[PDB]
Amino acid sequence: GSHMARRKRRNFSKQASEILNEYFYSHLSNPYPSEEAKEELARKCGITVSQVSNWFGNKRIRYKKNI
C-alpha cells in the first residue's frame, strides 16, 4: 500500500506510479482519452483529471501509432 494517509491523498506516491503505468497498459485497447477516463483514474488513484490528462497525452505521444 505505502499510502501517505488513511483518507484523501495528493499526486505522486505508489498510487501515482500505477495511475501512469496502468494507463500505458489499459488505454492500448482504446486510443482516444476522455474526461470520464481521466476521472476514473483520478478517483481510484486520488489524482486530479488534470494530472491524469498529463499522462494521457504523454502515453499517446510516446507509444505513437504508425509512421
Nearest to 40 by CA among 31, 28, 53: 53
Helix, strand and coil percent figures for the chain, each rounded to 5: 60, 0, 40
For 24, residues 6+ apart whose C-beta sits below 8 A from its C-beta are 59, 63
Report CA 4 to chain centroid distance, whole Å: 18
Q: Supply φ then ψ for residue 28, to 5 degrees.
A: -60, -40
Q: Cα separation of 11 and 33, whole Å?
A: 20
Report CA 30 to chain centroid distance, whole Å: 14
Method of determination?
NMR
Locus of grid cell 494521457: 56
